[PDB]
Amino acid sequence: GVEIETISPGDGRTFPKKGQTCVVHYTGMLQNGKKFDSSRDRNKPFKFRIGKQEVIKGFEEGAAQMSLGQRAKLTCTPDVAYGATGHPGVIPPNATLIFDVELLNLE
């Protein structure tokens, strides 16, 4: 259940592929709640690649459905990230997640 809500500007052509290492400014948001995570805090913008299941499934499908310079808004369903489990102390079980994602990558 990946729904993309894009703030317009960017290119719409540089799509990330497998074996490509990308740079994402993410920011976590809880539905009807406070924040829990931000790459803007540490300002080391989380260099990761595509094709190793490093990220969670809802964030992974949100990566390939974006392009260079775009600014989307993810809405991750509980069943793809942590809904049955819950990340201990940080994410409760059955939690729907919101992410502020801008793709300023390379490659």
Instruction: Judge whether 57 lies within some domain.
Output: yes
Instruction: Judge whether 16 lies within some domain.
Output: no
Active site residue 15: no
Active site residue 99: yes
Instruction: Judge whether 14 lies within some domain.
Output: no
Q: Which of 4, 15, 48, 56 is catalytic?
A: 56
Question: What is the rounded CA–CA span in Å between residue 32 and residue 6?
Answer: 21
Instruction: Judge whether 76 lies within some domain.
Output: yes
User: What is the Cβ-side half-sphere exposure of residue 36, based on CA atoms within 13 angstroms?
Assistant: 17
The CATH number for 68's domain is 3.10.50.40
Residue partners of 35: CB distance under 8 A and separation at least 6:
27, 28, 29
Residue partners of 18: CB distance under 8 A and separation at least 6:
50, 51
In the numeric block, which tokens belong to residue 92?
Answer: 């409760």
Active site residue 59: no
Per the structure, the count of domains in the chain is: 1
| Residue 55 structural domain | 21-103
Beta-sheet strands, E only, within 31-104: 47-49, 71-76, 97-103
Residue partners of 12: CB distance under 8 A and separation at least 6:
67, 70
Instruction: Judge whether 43 lies within some domain.
Output: yes
Active site residue 46: no
Method: cryo-EM
Instruction: Judge whether 2 lies within some domain.
Output: no
Reported resolution, Å:
4.8
Active site residue 56: yes
For residue 7, the cross-strand partners are 71
Q: Which of 50, 59, 91, 99 is catalytic?
A: 99
Instruction: Judge whether 13 lies within some domain.
Output: no
Phi and psi at residue 62, to the nearest 5°: -70, -20
Active site residue 36: yes
